[PDB]
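Please produce the structure of this protein holding 2-acetamido-2-deoxy-beta-D-glucopyranose.
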Amino acid sequence: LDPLSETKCTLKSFTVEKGIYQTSNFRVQPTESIVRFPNITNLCPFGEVFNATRFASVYAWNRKRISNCVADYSVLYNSASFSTFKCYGVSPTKLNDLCFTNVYADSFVIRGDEVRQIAPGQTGKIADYNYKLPDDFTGCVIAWNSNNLDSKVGGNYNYLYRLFRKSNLKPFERDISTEIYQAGSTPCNGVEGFNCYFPLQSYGFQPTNGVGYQPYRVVVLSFELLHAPATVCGPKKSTNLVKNKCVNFNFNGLTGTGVLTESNKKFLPFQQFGRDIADTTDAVRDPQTLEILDITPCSFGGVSVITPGTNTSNQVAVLYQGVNCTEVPVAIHADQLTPTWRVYSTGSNVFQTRAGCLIGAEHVNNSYECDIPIGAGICASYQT
Amino acid sequence: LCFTNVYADSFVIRGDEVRQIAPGQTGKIADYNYKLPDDFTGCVIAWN
Amino acid sequence: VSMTKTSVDCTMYICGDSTECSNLLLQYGSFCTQLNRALTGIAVEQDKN
Amino acid sequence: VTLADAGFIKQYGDCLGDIAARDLICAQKFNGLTVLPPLLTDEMIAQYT
Amino acid sequence: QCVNLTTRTQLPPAYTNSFTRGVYYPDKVFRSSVLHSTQDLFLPFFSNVTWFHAIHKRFDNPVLPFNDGVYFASTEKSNIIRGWIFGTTLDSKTQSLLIVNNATNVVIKVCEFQFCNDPFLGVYYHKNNKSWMESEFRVYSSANNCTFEYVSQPFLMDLEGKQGNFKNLREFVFKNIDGYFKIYSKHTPINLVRDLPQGFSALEPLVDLPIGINITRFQTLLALSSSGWTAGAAAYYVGYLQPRTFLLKYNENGTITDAVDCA
Amino acid sequence: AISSVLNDILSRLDKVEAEVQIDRLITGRLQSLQTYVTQQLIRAAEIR
Ligand SMILES: *[C@@H]1O[C@H](CO)[C@@H](O[C@@H]2O[C@H](CO)[C@@H](O[C@H]3O[C@H](CO)[C@@H](O)[C@H](O)[C@@H]3O)[C@H](O)[C@H]2NC(C)=O)[C@H](O)[C@H]1NC(C)=O
Ligand SMILES: *[C@@H]1O[C@H](CO)[C@@H](O[C@@H]2O[C@H](CO)[C@@H](O[C@H]3O[C@H](CO)[C@@H](O)[C@H](O)[C@@H]3O)[C@H](O)[C@H]2NC(C)=O)[C@H](O)[C@H]1NC(C)=O
Ligand SMILES: *[C@@H]1O[C@H](CO)[C@@H](O[C@@H]2O[C@H](CO)[C@@H](O[C@H]3O[C@H](CO)[C@@H](O)[C@H](O)[C@@H]3O)[C@H](O)[C@H]2NC(C)=O)[C@H](O)[C@H]1NC(C)=O
Ligand SMILES: *[C@@H]1O[C@H](CO)[C@@H](O[C@@H]2O[C@H](CO)[C@@H](O)[C@H](O)[C@H]2NC(C)=O)[C@H](O)[C@H]1NC(C)=O
Ligand SMILES: *[C@@H]1O[C@H](CO)[C@@H](O)[C@H](O)[C@H]1NC(C)=O
Ligand SMILES: *[C@@H]1O[C@H](CO)[C@@H](O)[C@H](O)[C@H]1NC(C)=O
Ligand SMILES: *[C@@H]1O[C@H](CO)[C@@H](O)[C@H](O)[C@H]1NC(C)=O
Ligand SMILES: *[C@@H]1O[C@H](CO)[C@@H](O)[C@H](O)[C@H]1NC(C)=O
Ligand SMILES: *[C@@H]1O[C@H](CO)[C@@H](O)[C@H](O)[C@H]1NC(C)=O
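Below is the modeled complex.
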């Protein structure tokens, strides 16, 4: 309602002693949103990824790059065709609100029981010997039964796994090699021997197989986020760009509240975000106009309320501490702020102290003894 | 245990969509015809 | 004789420009306040000293 | 003795652009950490002295 | 085509002190007026790099280990260092990576390659027209399963010149991490006769190749009737990265300007 | 948490997953202030 009621609320009391009290900070709120993404138009070629005529074997998993295009992950995520669409560093709803640096689709076929092994941290002959994800994988694993697309009644032996290996393979390693594996302690030469094996095996994929024993196509999407100049984005239009005003910006999924400004920070070509000592972004390259914008948070400070006792008077004065007055009147309640009571914006008795802008108290030339201390040599009192 | 007011919501869906009836979920059922609140207290019961 | 008076807004230190975080910090209750009383007690004492 | 942030007013022109980068005081203030002024100025202490 | 180029002299193996070189920008983020502590595969300060050279008489192009990644650099004139082979078997039992800067384009390719025992590229020298002409590409005899390929937009790069000291230092860092092969690099102009220059400068990131192979070793490619030839003089240095903690200083303009090797 | 930056969590995660990451940052940040205010209450007694 008013600064006195806010102190009554902050002290949890209906009556307030004479004093100066701290209350919730004023903070200038976003005037409008800004959104900025690269001005690319063509959609991502998912018809060649998900609707290719034939997929690769899991021993020889194909890796396709997605770049210089616009994504629409709602076309994928809302489709009932996917038996699994599991994300590991994002929620699937946020993919349309977000930007991606480099994006690789890993395409292959496995048994339906093995979809559980494609996730990061997993193990078993697929995860150990032909397709490993890193522990800190950011991306999503997408799978569907391709039984009707790819399976024949004798068995489509074109799809192969790796059953044998001298060591487990590294994250995103691909092993094509057809070297014979010796499970016996004896070495072996030529093509074959006892307890000696060709390291690959074909699946017996038939449409008469039980569910789980049927073929599943998999796409793993393996993007990296928010740290580098993007090349793929969600289907959101850029707004116009404005400067020297408080806004809710979003640069390539870097959402935040701030005032933008034309920076002299010399980014080298590979950089898109600059960080502060607090590990927060304080400059960004705009993705449409290749210029560097300083980000600074909106004007704010503590609000101290100066009062005689409730037993004396309900009149109060407000110190906007650490602020130039210039800013107070800027703090016009025309738009949103943390505090609501914009009633004092009237002034005509305001004062610039070294402590901040003081409102609702009259500056008098006659010095008195200290009563309520304001700071930097200034004190307030309730007098005739 | 004791209960203040109790409402049974009765409807039919596809078996794949039972996953979408839970609180916090999304997809065309959870988005366009039956939404639970984030802080839902209660139980979801389903059978073919 | 004295040291720099500091006021820290915990709500802005912890949940910087987020209402989602701010609504979670309310589940810790008095934690946001008791720190402001402690630092105000220190700050008031610098003028006393 | 080289003081840091005596509380005596901050005004964007000395906290962004050039004076945003080579500044710990700004890193502090942008995260809700504020340094308050003493009640007696360095002139008032010198009058008492 | 494949030949064992055998006309050379015998020297003992050389080494050199990598004073403060082989620091690179650890991530694609801007910082300035700050000291930043980071752990990565970095070249240890004052470490022994192995040293290699072309003379007149000398032409060392050996297979070298590639364990935890490599700092590579060359003090150079006349564009003699032209590429690298990376892989595990180097003989089409496995895949391998080829990088090569030929006369007109750069090429980057990943295959089950069958490489030559001594691989190189070759130039016809000062032959009547007063132009040096690239004419030999002795690197692979077969390339059986190409899972990655790139070739640059075309250019002409010169193949000629003679000077009493090297004019370029080109520096590189190579890392093969979680299926990604990462390259960082720098160019600086110089005037030095036969040593890796004492100084500091930081390598910017260049390219990041999704190659998915094991690299255990590597081999550089030099520019040169089938034997008896002149090697144009150039010198190159090989160091190994270690997982270490570095404190990196960014100046007011955001460039890594000095560094401390914590160990 | 998946990041130190409070907004990079909310840029990436919905209200179910974000609360798990955000409560980590609240827990550590709030412990950071209690450590500071304790050390400052102890220093204020040395200055007193
Ligand atoms: C990338 O290639 C590396 C080299 O081919 C390979 O390392 C090799 O792994 C084998 C199998 O463990 C080792 O075989 C020898 O192991 C010890 C000595 O190290 C002996 O006791 C054994 O009898 C056997 O001979 C190789 O020594 C080893 N060589 C090297 C240089 O590492 C990596 O495993 C490969 N990486 C991936 C991800 O496949
Ligand atoms: C540097 O090495 C390059 C190979 O690594 C080499 O590229 C090859 O150049 C020839 C001649 O231009 C190409 O020949 C084909 O060119 C087109 C293809 O559509 C056709 O009109 C021709 O009839 C012929 O088939 C090769 O295909 C090309 N190789 C590759 C992989 O692109 C450069 O020529 C080399 N540059 C120098 C200066 O030596
Ligand atoms: C960041 O990069 C800046 C630009 O490269 C650089 O500023 C440049 O500094 C030099 C050396 O002081 C100036 O050189 C000129 O100085 C005066 C004019 O001010 C002339 O009388 C001289 O003959 C000489 O030409 C540049 O003028 C100046 N650049 C500009 C356009 O102002 C900074 O020094 C760099 N910062 C750091 C920390 O390295
Ligand atoms: C509050 O901000 C105003 C700027 O809006 C400051 O006024 C400037 O002061 C300098 C020095 O006297 C002049 O050279 C400028 O032309 C003034 N400009 C304007 C528009 O006022 C004022 O000094 C600031 N006050 C405090 C206490 O910081
Ligand atoms: C693939 O085709 C199916 C229909 O066969 C369609 O529903 C789906 O959207 C397509 N997906 C892509 C990525 O083209
Ligand atoms: C944005 O458009 C301008 C021309 O309108 C062009 O200069 C720029 O290249 C575009 N952005 C990108 C990322 O290409
Ligand atoms: C406050 O004022 C009321 C009269 O308005 C009086 O009854 C009461 O005693 C006073 N209390 C104090 C503490 O002054
Ligand atoms: C470098 O090599 C020399 C051999 O001349 C050796 O004495 C020295 O200890 C080596 N130093 C390092 C750091 O490897
Ligand atoms: C000079 O170049 C031409 C082609 O450009 C070639 O036919 C000729 O043989 C060359 N002459 C010599 C001496 O190398």
